[PDB]
Design a protein around this ligand. Structure first.
Ligand code: CL
Ligand code: CL
Lengths: 275, 276
C-alpha cells in the first residue's frame, strides 16, 4: 500500500513506451480503485515530459471510468499547441483499451510580472492541532502515510458522530514525511497529488458519509491552477470548502499555501455520490 | 454587432451539418476577434444537442487560438461516456481545420438529493448601483447591450483613475434586456455566456488595464459548474474575485446568484496578459 513519501515519488516515475506514451503503476488498494490524486499527478508528469523544462500552470480533467489498482495505466499525450510562452497537451489515461480519464494541461515559461495574492487565512498553527491518526483512533477496528496531516476541523468519520453535520469547511496542515525531489515538475506533480487527496472530505461531511461509506462517491472532475512553488521542507495549509451541493454532486474548492504564506495552488473538483 | 438579447440567443442557433458536427456563426467585430463567451456558449449547445434531455452540469475548456470573426466556427462533438447518470462530451471548435478551442462537457439526469449552498453576500441592490454605460460615459471619446449591468465596484477604466487600485473584487447585478427562451439548454448556454463575459475584469484592475487596453489580455481557459437554473425574469448577482495573479497570468472566479438567492453556477478562468 502507498505508505511512504518515496512511494508517492515512485508513482511519478513513469516508463516511457513510445514517443508520447508512458506507463504508470501502483500498489493495489483495498477496494482495488485507483484514487484521483494518483492519476492527476501521473497525467501531469506524462504531459510535462513532452514539454521539457516548461512549468505546469493548469490542468483540467474528467474521470470517466475508475482505474483498477491491480493493472498498470497507460498515458497517451497529444500536443495541442506549442507557443513561446504557453504550451498545451491532452492526456488520455487507459487500461486495456478502456479510457479512464481525459485531461488538458497547460505549461508556461517563467515570467517576472505582477505578483499578487490574497492573504492566507489567520488560523491556529500546525503545532496547535490534532493529528489525523489520533483523531481516528476510536474507529480503529473499522479499518504509515506519505504526509502527516493535522486537522483543524473534524475529519468525516469523526464528524459522522457529531449530532449534526458541521459546516462544509475543512482546514488541514500537511507535511511531507521525507524529501521531495528538487525538480520543478516533480514539485508540481506532488502538489497535484495533494490537491485531490482530501479535497472532497468537506463535502462528505455535509453528505453524512466518509471515504469508505456508507454512501460511496466518485470524482467527476478535478482542476488545478499552479501559481507558486510548494516548499515541501515545511508545513502547508490546505484551506477547503464547499460552495454548493445539489443533485448528488458536491463541489469542493481548496487553496494550498506554504506555511510562509505563499499561495501555491487553487483546485476545484466535483464529486458524485451514489444514490 | 451583438447588441440585443435576441442577438445573443441567435449565437446559439447552430446549423447541424452532420450527426455530431455543427456550425456556429457571428457578426464580424472591429478587430475580428471572437470572444470566449460566444465559443463557450456555442460549444455547450453543440454538446447538449448530442445529449438530449440531460442537463448541463459542468464544462472545462482551453482557448488555444483566437477565432476570426469573419468566418464561421465548426463544433465537432465526440461522445465519451453515456448511461444512467452522467454523459460526457468532447467539443473541438475549428476554422478551416485550425483548432481554436478544446472543451470537455458533462451532463446529468435530474435527481433530488442533498441541496445545500453558501448564502449570497449581503450587498446593495440593483437600483442603488449606477449602470455601466453611465459609469463609462466620462470616457466616451476613447471609445445597446444584451444585459443591463450595474457595477457595485468600479469598472476597470474607472478604477484605472484611482491612486490605490482597489481589491480585485467585482460584484455586478445583471438583467437580461429581454426574455430568455424557456428551455433548460438555452438557459445553461446563456449562463455560460455570462460566466465568461465580465469575469476577468477584477484581474484587469490589479493589472492596471481594461478590456480595450493598454495591456491586452486573452483567456487561457474557462470552467463552469452549473448547479441551479438561472431566473432571467429578474436580476442576477455575479460575485467575482481574484485570489492570485502571477507570471503574466491572473485567475478569476465568480459565483452567479438569482436575486432570490439561489446559487446558479460557479466559474473560474485564467487570463494571460501580453508583455508590458
Ligand atoms: Cl504563447
Ligand atoms: Cl498523522
Amino acid at each position: 500500500m502507498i505508505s511512504t513519501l518515496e512511494d508517492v515519488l515512485s508513482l511519478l516515475d513513469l516508463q516511457q513506451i513510445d514517443d508520447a506514451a508512458f506507463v504508470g503503476t501502483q500498489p493495489d488498494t483495498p477496494n482495488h480503485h485507483i484514487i484521483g490524486s494518483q492519476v492527476a499527478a501521473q497525467a501531469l508528469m506524462a504531459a510535462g515530459r513532452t514539454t521539457p523544462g516548461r512549468l505546469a500552470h493548469s490542468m483540467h480533467m474528467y474521470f470517466l471510468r475508475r482505474g483498477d489498482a491491480r493493472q498498470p495505466i497507460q498515458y497517451d499525450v497529444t500536443p495541442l499547441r506549442d507557443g513561446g510562452t504557453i504550451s498545451s497537451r491532452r492526456v488520455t489515461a487507459s487500461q486495456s483499451g478502456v479510457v479512464l480519464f481525459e485531461a488538458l494541461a497547460s505549461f508556461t515559461i517563467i515570467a517576472d510580472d505582477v505578483d499578487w495574492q490574497q492573504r492566507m487565512p489567520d488560523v491556529a498553527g500546525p503545532s496547535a492541532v490534532h493529528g489525523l491518526e489520533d483523531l481516528l483512533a476510536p474507529y480503529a477496528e473499522e479499518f504509515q502515510r506519505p504526509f502527516t496531516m493535522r486537522y483543524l476541523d473534524a475529519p468525516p468519520r469523526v464528524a459522522l458522530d457529531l449530532s449534526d453535520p458541521p459546516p462544509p469547511r475543512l482546514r488541514i496542515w500537511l507535511r511531507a514525511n521525507g524529501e521531495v525531489t528538487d525538480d520543478p515538475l516533480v514539485n508540481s506533480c506532488v502538489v497535484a497529488y495533494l490537491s485531490a487527496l482530501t479535497l472532497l472530505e468537506c463535502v462528505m461531511t455535509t453528505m453524512r458519509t466518509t471515504p469508505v461509506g456508507p454512501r460511496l462517491s466518485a470524482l467527476v472532475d478535478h482542476t488545478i491552477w499552479f501559481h507558486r512553488a510548494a516548499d515541501f521542507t515545511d508545513w502547508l495549509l490546505f484551506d477547503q470548502f464547499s460552495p454548493s451541493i445539489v443533485g448528488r454532486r458536491g463541489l469542493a474548492t481548496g487553496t494550498l499555501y506554504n506555511r510562509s504564506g505563499e499561495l501555491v495552488c487553487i483546485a476545484t473538483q466535483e464529486g458524485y455520490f451514489a444514490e
